[PDB]
Amino acid sequence: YLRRFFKAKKLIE
């Protein structure tokens, strides 16, 4: 899941 949970927050935390 972190696939989208990582790239997400990274730029949109």
As separate numbers, helices (DSSP H) first and strands (DSSP E) second, the chain gives 1, 0
DSSP 8-state class, residue 13: -
Residue found by looking up tokens 């949109």 in the block: 12
For the record, the structure tokens of 13 come out as 């935390």
Report how far residue 10's alpha carbon sits from residue 2's, in angstroms, rounded to the nearest whole number: 11
Report how far residue 6's alpha carbon sits from residue 13's, in angstroms, rounded to the nearest whole number: 9
DSSP 8-state class, residue 1: -
What ranges in 1-13 are assigned the alpha helix state H? 2-12
